[PDB]
Amino acid sequence: GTGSQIMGNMFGVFNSAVLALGGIIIMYTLMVSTMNTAHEGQMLGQKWSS
Amino acid sequence: DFIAEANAKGWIMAGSYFFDLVKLNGSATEDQFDTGTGLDKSSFDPTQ
């Protein structure tokens, strides 16, 4: 198409925003995964492979 | 020119620029004869 690229820019900025937020959630779940791993003593959980 | 002022204002008034945005979005997606000369206010009467 050839329409106005306002969608492109707004999707890019909102995409980057959600990357930042989601990554923060991945740090959160990363500390969760690590303390579960430490508590159990086995590598990165027991339900899924590493 | 309204863009800088809109940046200074924030977001709680965004819609006030709505139609302005519209007349910008058009600009990216897109003799005369006299009036009010007042000779109508003139008057002619013969009975005088």
Both tokens of residue A40?
Answer: 């159990």
State how far Cα B24 lies from the chain centre. 15
Contacts of A6 in chain B (CB under 8 A): 25
Q: At what resolution in Å was this solved?
A: 4.6
CA-to-CA dists, residue B27 to B7, B17, B23, B24, angstroms: 21, 15, 6, 5
Place of tokens 């990357």: A19
CA-to-CA dists, residue A20 to A15, A25, A29, B18, angstroms: 9, 9, 14, 29
Tell me the technique behind this structure: cryo-EM
- Cβ partners under 8 Å of residue A33, min gap 6: A44, A45
DSSP state of B12: T
Both tokens of residue B30?
Answer: 């897109």
Euclidean distance between CA atoms A1 and B34, whole angstroms: 44
Q: Tell me, what amino acid is at B10?
A: G
Chain A residue with the nearest C-alpha to that of B21: A6
